[PDB]
Amino acid sequence: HMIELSLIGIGTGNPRHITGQAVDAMNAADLILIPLKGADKSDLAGLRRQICAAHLTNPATKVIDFALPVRDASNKGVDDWHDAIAETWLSEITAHVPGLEGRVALLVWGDPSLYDSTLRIAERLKSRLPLTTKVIPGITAIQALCAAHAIPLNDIGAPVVITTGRQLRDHGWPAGTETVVAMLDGECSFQSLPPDGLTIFWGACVAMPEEVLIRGPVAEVTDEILQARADLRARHGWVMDIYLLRRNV
């Protein structure tokens, strides 16, 4: 017996981001596992279900909501948490495909390759299930941002650094590039850089109805971005943002 586990990218919140390949993988599944709404409102558990429902035409596919484990904030904590998530998946798969021969899908925001834990958690399962893992690409927040601003990611023939807010705060401007895209940033970390010669293309809730886009010289639009971000957060209870920095010195 063999479980085929598909990690299906579903894009950045625009329900039209889903690809035909993703639709096909949903329709081939015996079981689709989706997390229940929890504390993290940015998971948009309802939107995930909506996207699934808009395209699932296989009448036999089971769609099963499950409670995602909570990380122990009082803790290794991340490690135990990911272990617990794997255990939950393993229990769900075993309960619902007890013959252990079948196709199971998880729906992953954006693309599964990009700052997302699902693939590495799934690796834990390889030694406990007869398992093959497949990945279906989805639209990333990087591409959504560039499309919204109608800008290239790269300068002509030039490298690009993709990084995190914390990496920018710990190390400053990355070596060997004039373009940086920052993800996983909860604190507009570009504000800690020298603004000299930097242009920012910023977006919050990109490709969603709440989308806000701001562009300009970092020295001029930093406070505009801080305010827009805080406003969006106050009114919605959560915010996800991403930005591209272009250096011209």
Ligand X SMILES: Nc1ncnc2c1ncn2[C@@H]1O[C@H](CSCC[C@H](N)C(=O)O)[C@@H](O)[C@H]1O
User: DSSP assignment of 183-220, as one string?
Assistant: ES-SS-GGGGS--TTEEEEEEESTTSTT-EEEEEEHHH
**Closest distance of CB 207 from ligand X, Å:** 6
**Closest distance of CB 87 from its own copies, Å:** 20
CA distances from 112 to 7, 26, 138, 216 (A): 7, 15, 7, 31
> Would you tell me the crossing angle of helices 20-28 and 45-55 to the nearest 10 degrees?
80
**Closest distance of CB 240 from ligand X, Å:** 4
Q: Specify the DSSP class assigned to residue 176.
A: T
Contacts (CB under 6 A) with ligand X, residues 105-134: 109-111, 114-116
Contacts (CB under 8 A) with its own copies, residues 123-142: 133-140, 142
Q: Specify the DSSP class assigned to residue 99.
A: T
Distance CA 66, CA 80 (A): 18
Among candidate residues 176, 183, 158, 174, the one with its CA nearest the CA of residue 244: 183
Count of residues engaged in binding ligand X, rule: CB under 6 A: 21
3-state secondary structure of 98: coil
Among candidate residues 71, 118, 222, the one with its CA nearest the CA of residue 214: 222
- By rule CB under 6 A, what string of x and - marks binding of each residue 166-195 to ligand X? -----------------xx-----------
Q: Which is nearer to ligand X, 125 or 208 (CB)?
A: 208
Q: Which is nearer to ligand X, 20 or 98 (CB)?
A: 20
**Considering CB distances under 5 to 8 angstroms, the limit depending on partner class, which of its own copies, ligand X, none binds residue 63?**
none
**Closest distance of CB 189 from ligand X, Å:** 11
Which H or E run includes 132? strand 131-136
Among the listed residues 112, 178, 201, 242, the single contact to its own copies using CB under 8 A: 112
Q: Is 152 in the site for its own copies (CB under 8 A)?
A: yes
Contacts (CB under 8 A) with its own copies, residues 23-62: 24
Q: Which is nearer to ligand X, 102 or 174 (CB)?
A: 174
Distance CA 130, CA 126 (A): 7
Site of interaction with ligand X (CB under 6 A) = 12-13, 109-111, 114-116, 140-141, 183-184, 203-208, 240-242
Site of interaction with its own copies (CB under 8 A) = 9, 11, 14-21, 24, 111-116, 119-120, 133-140, 142-144, 146-148, 150-154, 156-164, 166-167, 171, 174-177, 184
